[PDB]
Amino acid sequence: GGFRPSRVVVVAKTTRYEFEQQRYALKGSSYSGLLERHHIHTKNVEHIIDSLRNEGIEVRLVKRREYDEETVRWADAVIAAGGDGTMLLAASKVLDRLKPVIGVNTDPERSEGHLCLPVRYTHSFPEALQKFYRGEFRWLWRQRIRLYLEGTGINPVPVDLHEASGPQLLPVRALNEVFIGESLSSRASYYEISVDDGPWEKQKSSGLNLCTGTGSKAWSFNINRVATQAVEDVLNIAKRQLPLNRELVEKVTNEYNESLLYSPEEPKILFSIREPIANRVFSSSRQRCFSSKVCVRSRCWDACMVVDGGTSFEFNDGAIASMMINKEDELRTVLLE
Protein backbone atom coordinates (compact mmCIF):
# COMPACT_ATOMS: atom_id res chain seq x y z
CA GLY A 1 0.00 0.00 0.00
CA GLY A 2 2.97 2.29 -0.50
CA PHE A 3 3.16 5.29 -2.82
CA ARG A 4 6.07 6.72 -4.81
CA PRO A 5 5.37 8.98 -7.80
CA SER A 6 7.84 9.32 -10.66
CA ARG A 7 6.68 12.70 -11.98
CA VAL A 8 5.65 15.57 -9.75
CA VAL A 9 4.56 19.13 -10.46
CA VAL A 10 5.18 21.54 -7.60
CA VAL A 11 3.06 24.69 -7.79
CA ALA A 12 4.51 27.31 -5.45
CA LYS A 13 2.82 30.49 -4.28
CA THR A 14 3.98 33.89 -5.43
CA THR A 15 5.47 35.88 -2.55
CA ARG A 16 4.60 39.50 -1.76
CA TYR A 17 8.17 40.42 -2.66
CA GLU A 18 7.84 38.70 -6.05
CA PHE A 19 4.55 40.55 -6.34
CA GLU A 20 6.26 43.89 -5.70
CA GLN A 21 9.02 42.99 -8.17
CA GLN A 22 6.53 42.14 -10.94
CA ARG A 23 5.01 45.62 -10.48
CA TYR A 24 7.96 48.03 -10.60
CA ALA A 25 14.11 49.96 -1.29
CA LEU A 26 12.06 50.57 1.89
CA LYS A 27 8.76 52.06 0.73
CA GLY A 28 6.29 52.16 3.60
CA SER A 29 5.88 49.93 6.65
CA SER A 30 6.81 46.23 6.48
CA TYR A 31 9.73 46.86 4.12
CA SER A 32 12.37 44.16 4.58
CA GLY A 33 9.76 42.08 6.39
CA LEU A 34 8.67 41.09 2.88
CA LEU A 35 12.19 39.99 1.99
CA GLU A 36 12.55 37.86 5.12
CA ARG A 37 9.23 36.21 4.24
CA HIS A 38 10.45 35.67 0.68
CA HIS A 39 13.67 33.92 1.74
CA ILE A 40 11.85 31.57 4.11
CA HIS A 41 9.49 30.44 1.35
CA THR A 42 12.32 30.07 -1.19
CA LYS A 43 14.51 28.07 1.21
CA ASN A 44 11.59 25.72 1.77
CA VAL A 45 10.74 25.29 -1.91
CA GLU A 46 14.37 24.34 -2.57
CA HIS A 47 14.31 21.82 0.29
CA ILE A 48 11.22 20.15 -1.22
CA ILE A 49 12.65 20.08 -4.75
CA ASP A 50 16.04 18.79 -3.62
CA SER A 51 14.40 16.05 -1.52
CA LEU A 52 12.24 14.87 -4.45
CA ARG A 53 15.11 14.85 -6.93
CA ASN A 54 17.20 12.97 -4.36
CA GLU A 55 14.55 10.24 -4.45
CA GLY A 56 14.91 10.02 -8.26
CA ILE A 57 11.63 11.85 -8.87
CA GLU A 58 11.36 14.10 -11.93
CA VAL A 59 10.06 17.49 -10.79
CA ARG A 60 8.67 20.56 -12.55
CA LEU A 61 8.36 23.74 -10.48
CA VAL A 62 5.73 26.24 -11.62
CA LYS A 63 4.09 29.43 -10.44
CA ARG A 64 0.36 30.20 -10.85
CA ARG A 65 0.52 31.39 -14.48
CA GLU A 66 2.21 28.16 -15.62
CA TYR A 67 0.24 25.74 -13.44
CA ASP A 68 -2.05 24.32 -16.12
CA GLU A 69 -4.09 21.21 -16.79
CA GLU A 70 -1.45 19.89 -19.18
CA THR A 71 1.16 19.99 -16.41
CA VAL A 72 -1.31 18.31 -14.05
CA ARG A 73 -1.83 15.45 -16.52
CA TRP A 74 1.92 15.02 -17.02
CA ALA A 75 2.37 14.63 -13.27
CA ASP A 76 1.78 11.61 -11.05
CA ALA A 77 1.07 13.92 -8.10
CA VAL A 78 0.61 17.66 -7.51
CA ILE A 79 2.37 19.36 -4.59
CA ALA A 80 1.17 22.80 -3.50
CA ALA A 81 4.04 24.73 -1.89
CA GLY A 82 2.67 27.65 0.12
CA GLY A 83 -0.43 27.80 2.28
CA ASP A 84 -4.06 26.73 2.11
CA GLY A 85 -4.45 29.31 -0.66
CA THR A 86 -1.91 27.31 -2.69
CA MET A 87 -3.81 24.07 -2.01
CA LEU A 88 -7.03 25.64 -3.28
CA LEU A 89 -5.17 26.84 -6.38
CA ALA A 90 -3.72 23.38 -6.99
CA ALA A 91 -7.00 21.57 -6.34
CA SER A 92 -8.81 23.91 -8.74
CA LYS A 93 -7.08 22.23 -11.73
CA VAL A 94 -7.43 18.62 -10.55
CA LEU A 95 -10.70 16.94 -11.48
CA ASP A 96 -9.55 13.29 -11.31
CA ARG A 97 -10.35 11.58 -8.03
CA LEU A 98 -7.27 9.30 -8.35
CA LYS A 99 -4.67 12.08 -8.66
CA PRO A 100 -2.93 12.83 -5.33
CA VAL A 101 -2.61 16.47 -4.27
CA ILE A 102 -0.27 17.22 -1.34
CA GLY A 103 0.30 20.56 0.40
CA VAL A 104 3.52 21.71 2.05
CA ASN A 105 3.42 24.76 4.32
CA THR A 106 6.33 26.96 3.20
CA ASP A 107 5.92 29.71 5.85
CA PRO A 108 4.52 28.13 9.02
CA GLU A 109 4.88 31.32 11.09
CA ARG A 110 2.54 33.18 8.72
CA SER A 111 0.63 30.36 6.94
CA GLU A 112 -2.01 28.33 8.78
CA GLY A 113 -1.65 25.39 6.38
CA HIS A 114 -4.66 23.45 7.65
CA LEU A 115 -4.81 21.62 4.28
CA CYS A 116 -1.04 20.94 4.24
CA LEU A 117 1.20 18.34 5.79
CA PRO A 118 2.15 18.94 9.43
CA VAL A 119 4.74 21.69 9.82
CA ARG A 120 7.59 19.32 10.73
CA TYR A 121 7.68 18.00 7.16
CA THR A 122 8.40 21.49 5.78
CA HIS A 123 12.06 21.02 6.74
CA SER A 124 11.92 17.20 6.97
CA PHE A 125 10.55 16.35 3.56
CA PRO A 126 12.65 13.22 2.90
CA GLU A 127 10.84 11.88 5.97
CA ALA A 128 7.46 12.47 4.38
CA LEU A 129 8.71 10.81 1.19
CA GLN A 130 9.77 7.77 3.20
CA LYS A 131 6.43 7.58 4.97
CA PHE A 132 4.68 7.67 1.58
CA TYR A 133 6.99 5.01 0.17
CA ARG A 134 6.35 2.78 3.18
CA GLY A 135 2.56 3.20 3.34
CA GLU A 136 2.77 4.99 6.70
CA PHE A 137 -0.15 7.29 5.91
CA ARG A 138 -3.78 7.09 4.87
CA TRP A 139 -5.70 8.47 1.90
CA LEU A 140 -8.31 11.13 2.62
CA TRP A 141 -10.80 11.88 -0.14
CA ARG A 142 -12.17 15.36 0.54
CA GLN A 143 -15.64 15.97 -0.83
CA ARG A 144 -16.06 18.91 -3.20
CA ILE A 145 -19.08 20.83 -4.51
CA ARG A 146 -19.89 21.07 -8.22
CA LEU A 147 -21.85 23.90 -9.80
CA TYR A 148 -24.41 23.86 -12.62
CA LEU A 149 -25.75 27.01 -14.28
CA GLU A 150 -28.93 27.54 -16.27
CA GLY A 151 -31.54 30.22 -16.86
CA THR A 152 -31.66 33.40 -18.93
CA GLY A 153 -28.88 35.88 -19.58
CA ILE A 154 -26.28 33.56 -18.09
CA ASN A 155 -22.51 33.76 -18.59
CA PRO A 156 -20.70 30.58 -17.47
CA VAL A 157 -17.18 31.79 -18.24
CA PRO A 158 -14.95 31.61 -15.15
CA VAL A 159 -13.04 34.65 -13.96
CA ASP A 160 -9.69 34.16 -12.21
CA LEU A 161 -9.75 36.49 -9.19
CA HIS A 162 -5.95 36.41 -8.86
CA GLU A 163 -5.60 37.92 -12.38
CA ALA A 164 -33.06 30.15 -21.97
CA SER A 165 -30.43 27.42 -21.59
CA GLY A 166 -30.17 23.99 -19.97
CA PRO A 167 -27.86 23.20 -17.05
CA GLN A 168 -24.18 23.36 -17.90
CA LEU A 169 -21.35 22.15 -15.69
CA LEU A 170 -19.01 24.86 -14.52
CA PRO A 171 -15.30 24.04 -14.92
CA VAL A 172 -14.23 24.33 -11.28
CA ARG A 173 -15.10 22.50 -8.06
CA ALA A 174 -15.31 24.02 -4.56
CA LEU A 175 -13.01 22.48 -1.99
CA ASN A 176 -13.89 25.15 0.58
CA GLU A 177 -17.11 26.84 -0.44
CA VAL A 178 -19.28 28.61 -2.96
CA PHE A 179 -20.01 32.17 -1.91
CA ILE A 180 -22.93 33.94 -3.61
CA GLY A 181 -23.61 37.65 -3.36
CA GLU A 182 -23.63 41.12 -4.83
CA SER A 183 -20.21 42.42 -5.72
CA LEU A 184 -20.79 45.71 -3.88
CA SER A 185 -20.02 44.95 -0.24
CA SER A 186 -22.84 47.16 1.09
CA ARG A 187 -25.61 46.10 -1.30
CA ALA A 188 -28.10 43.59 0.07
CA SER A 189 -28.39 40.41 -1.99
CA TYR A 190 -31.77 39.04 -3.13
CA TYR A 191 -32.37 35.44 -4.29
CA GLU A 192 -34.65 32.44 -3.92
CA ILE A 193 -33.28 29.17 -2.52
CA SER A 194 -34.54 25.59 -2.67
CA VAL A 195 -32.89 23.07 -0.35
CA ASP A 196 -33.08 19.37 -1.24
CA ASP A 197 -35.76 20.19 -3.83
CA GLY A 198 -37.93 21.91 -1.25
CA PRO A 199 -40.20 24.87 -1.94
CA TRP A 200 -38.59 28.10 -3.11
CA GLU A 201 -38.14 30.72 -0.38
CA LYS A 202 -37.09 34.33 -0.93
CA GLN A 203 -34.18 35.65 1.12
CA LYS A 204 -32.52 39.03 1.64
CA SER A 205 -29.05 39.00 3.16
CA SER A 206 -25.36 39.76 2.69
CA GLY A 207 -24.89 36.55 0.71
CA LEU A 208 -24.89 32.77 0.97
CA ASN A 209 -22.06 30.45 1.94
CA LEU A 210 -22.16 26.81 0.86
CA CYS A 211 -19.19 24.87 2.22
CA THR A 212 -17.84 21.32 2.34
CA GLY A 213 -16.54 19.57 5.43
CA THR A 214 -13.13 20.90 4.43
CA GLY A 215 -14.60 24.40 4.16
CA SER A 216 -16.44 24.10 7.48
CA LYS A 217 -13.32 25.44 9.27
CA ALA A 218 -12.81 28.37 6.85
CA TRP A 219 -15.19 31.24 6.00
CA SER A 220 -18.20 29.25 7.29
CA PHE A 221 -16.64 28.93 10.75
CA ASN A 222 -16.24 32.70 11.10
CA ILE A 223 -19.70 33.33 9.67
CA ASN A 224 -21.44 31.16 12.28
CA ARG A 225 -19.24 30.80 15.35
CA VAL A 226 -20.45 32.36 18.57
CA ALA A 227 -18.24 34.67 20.62
CA THR A 228 -17.38 33.60 24.14
CA GLN A 229 -18.88 36.87 25.40
CA ALA A 230 -22.17 36.20 23.59
CA VAL A 231 -22.58 32.98 25.58
CA GLU A 232 -21.58 34.71 28.82
CA ASP A 233 -24.50 37.05 28.14
CA VAL A 234 -26.85 34.28 26.96
CA LEU A 235 -26.13 32.20 30.07
CA ASN A 236 -26.82 35.27 32.20
CA ILE A 237 -30.29 35.85 30.77
CA ALA A 238 -30.71 32.17 31.64
CA LYS A 239 -30.18 32.45 35.39
CA ARG A 240 -32.15 35.71 35.51
CA GLN A 241 -35.06 34.92 33.19
CA LEU A 242 -25.76 26.16 37.98
CA PRO A 243 -22.73 28.42 38.39
CA LEU A 244 -20.75 30.17 35.64
CA ASN A 245 -16.88 31.12 35.11
CA ARG A 246 -14.37 31.30 32.54
CA GLU A 247 -14.41 27.50 32.85
CA LEU A 248 -18.07 26.86 32.04
CA VAL A 249 -18.30 29.63 29.44
CA GLU A 250 -15.29 28.25 27.55
CA LYS A 251 -16.68 24.71 27.75
CA VAL A 252 -20.05 25.68 26.28
CA THR A 253 -18.56 27.98 23.62
CA ASN A 254 -16.30 25.22 22.28
CA GLU A 255 -19.00 22.58 22.24
CA TYR A 256 -21.23 24.95 20.28
CA ASN A 257 -18.44 25.90 17.91
CA GLU A 258 -17.24 22.34 17.34
CA SER A 259 -20.82 21.63 16.22
CA LEU A 260 -20.06 23.83 13.19
CA LEU A 261 -17.23 21.61 11.92
CA TYR A 262 -17.77 18.30 10.14
CA SER A 263 -15.71 15.62 8.42
CA PRO A 264 -14.21 16.43 4.99
CA GLU A 265 -15.32 12.92 3.96
CA GLU A 266 -19.04 13.57 4.63
CA PRO A 267 -20.87 14.34 1.34
CA LYS A 268 -23.21 17.06 2.57
CA ILE A 269 -23.26 20.85 2.18
CA LEU A 270 -23.28 23.23 5.14
CA PHE A 271 -25.38 26.12 3.91
CA SER A 272 -25.53 29.49 5.73
CA ILE A 273 -27.58 32.62 5.09
CA ARG A 274 -25.05 35.36 5.82
CA GLU A 275 -26.57 38.25 7.81
CA PRO A 276 -30.25 37.84 6.84
CA ILE A 277 -32.59 40.82 7.06
CA ALA A 278 -35.87 39.88 8.72
CA ASN A 279 -38.01 42.88 9.90
CA ARG A 280 -41.63 43.85 9.10
CA VAL A 281 -41.36 43.64 5.28
CA PHE A 282 -39.03 40.68 4.70
CA SER A 283 -38.79 37.34 6.50
CA SER A 284 -36.25 34.51 6.67
CA SER A 285 -36.49 30.83 7.61
CA ARG A 286 -33.54 28.77 8.83
CA GLN A 287 -30.11 30.40 9.02
CA ARG A 288 -27.89 27.33 8.59
CA CYS A 289 -28.58 23.69 7.74
CA PHE A 290 -27.12 20.60 6.14
CA SER A 291 -28.21 19.37 2.73
CA SER A 292 -27.23 17.32 -0.28
CA LYS A 293 -28.46 19.87 -2.81
CA VAL A 294 -29.29 23.56 -2.87
CA CYS A 295 -30.49 25.48 -5.91
CA VAL A 296 -30.33 29.28 -6.05
CA ARG A 297 -32.33 31.61 -8.29
CA SER A 298 -30.55 34.93 -8.72
CA ARG A 299 -32.54 38.12 -8.28
CA CYS A 300 -29.39 40.23 -8.17
CA TRP A 301 -28.15 43.20 -10.18
CA ASP A 302 -24.34 42.68 -10.24
CA ALA A 303 -23.61 39.53 -8.26
CA CYS A 304 -21.07 36.70 -8.41
CA MET A 305 -20.74 33.05 -7.47
CA VAL A 306 -17.21 32.70 -6.07
CA VAL A 307 -15.49 29.32 -5.69
CA ASP A 308 -12.77 29.01 -3.02
CA GLY A 309 -12.02 32.73 -3.17
CA GLY A 310 -10.33 32.17 -6.54
CA THR A 311 -12.77 31.69 -9.40
CA SER A 312 -15.78 33.91 -9.99
CA PHE A 313 -18.88 33.53 -12.17
CA GLU A 314 -21.57 36.02 -13.13
CA PHE A 315 -24.84 35.36 -11.30
CA ASN A 316 -27.50 37.96 -12.04
CA ASP A 317 -31.28 38.01 -12.22
CA GLY A 318 -32.43 35.10 -14.39
CA ALA A 319 -29.47 32.84 -13.57
CA ILE A 320 -30.14 29.58 -11.72
CA ALA A 321 -27.32 27.67 -9.99
CA SER A 322 -27.42 24.08 -8.73
CA MET A 323 -24.83 22.85 -6.20
CA MET A 324 -24.37 19.20 -5.19
CA ILE A 325 -21.66 16.69 -4.20
CA ASN A 326 -20.47 13.97 -6.60
CA LYS A 327 -18.06 11.13 -5.81
CA GLU A 328 -15.96 11.76 -8.91
CA ASP A 329 -15.13 15.25 -7.52
CA GLU A 330 -13.50 13.79 -4.39
CA LEU A 331 -10.04 15.33 -3.97
CA ARG A 332 -7.38 12.72 -3.21
CA THR A 333 -5.23 13.87 -0.25
CA VAL A 334 -2.88 12.28 2.30
CA LEU A 335 -2.79 12.20 6.09
CA LEU A 336 0.48 11.88 8.04
CA GLU A 337 1.44 12.17 11.71
Q: Which residues bind a second copy (CB under 8 A)?
A: 28-29, 109-112, 114, 152, 161, 179, 181-187, 205-207, 219, 222-223, 226-227, 229-231, 233-235, 237-238, 241-242, 248, 251-252, 255-256, 259, 275-281, 286-288, 304, 306, 309, 317-318
| CA–CA distance, 182 with 300 (Å, rounded to integer) | 7
- 22 burial (CB, 10 Å; 0-12 / 13-18 / 19+) is exposed
| CA–CA distance, 125 with 129 (Å, rounded to integer) | 6
C-beta of 83 vs 100, nearer to ligand NAP: 83
CA neighbor of 82 nearest in space, from 175, 9, 10, 12 = 12
Q: Where are the beta strands (DSSP E) in the chain?
A: 7-12, 58-62, 77-82, 101-105, 138-142, 145-151, 159-160, 165-174, 177-182, 189-195, 201-205, 208-211, 269-273, 288-291, 293-298, 303-307, 311-314, 319-325, 331-335
Other beta carbons within 10 Å of 230: 13
C-beta of 83 vs 267, nearer to Fe ion: 83
| CA–CA distance, 11 with 79 (Å, rounded to integer) | 6
The interface partner of residue 100, options being ligand NAP, Fe ion, a second copy, none and the CB cut-off 5 to 8 Å by kind, is none
Least distance to ligand NAP from the beta carbon of 113, Å?
4
The interface partner of residue 318, options being ligand NAP, Fe ion, a second copy, none and the CB cut-off 5 to 8 Å by kind, is a second copy
Least distance to Fe ion from the beta carbon of 83, Å?
4
The interface partner of residue 88, options being Fe ion, ligand NAP, a second copy, none and the CB cut-off 5 to 8 Å by kind, is ligand NAP
Least distance to a second copy from the beta carbon of 33, Å?
12
C-beta of 259 vs 283, nearer to Fe ion: 283
Binding residues (CB under 6 A) for ligand NAP: these are: 83-85, 88, 111-115, 176-177, 186, 188, 205-206, 214-215, 217-219, 222, 275, 277, 279, 281, 308-309
Least distance to ligand NAP from the beta carbon of 165, Å?
28
Least distance to Fe ion from the beta carbon of 16, Å?
11
Cβ 268 vs Cβ 292: under 8 Å: yes
Least distance to Fe ion from the beta carbon of 49, Å?
21
- Rounded alpha-carbon distances, angstroms, from residue 278 to 68, 199, 207, 226, 298: 45, 19, 14, 20, 19
C-beta of 83 vs 310, nearer to Fe ion: 83
C-beta of 277 vs 289, nearer to ligand NAP: 277
The interface partner of residue 176, options being a second copy, Fe ion, ligand NAP, none and the CB cut-off 5 to 8 Å by kind, is ligand NAP
Least distance to a second copy from the beta carbon of 262, Å?
15
- 331 burial (CB, 10 Å; 0-12 / 13-18 / 19+) is buried
The phi-psi region of residue 171 (left if phi > 0; otherwise alpha if psi is between -120 and 50; otherwise beta) is alpha
C-beta of 85 vs 103, nearer to Fe ion: 85
CA neighbor of 321 nearest in space, from 219, 179, 216 = 179
C-beta of 112 vs 196, nearer to ligand NAP: 112
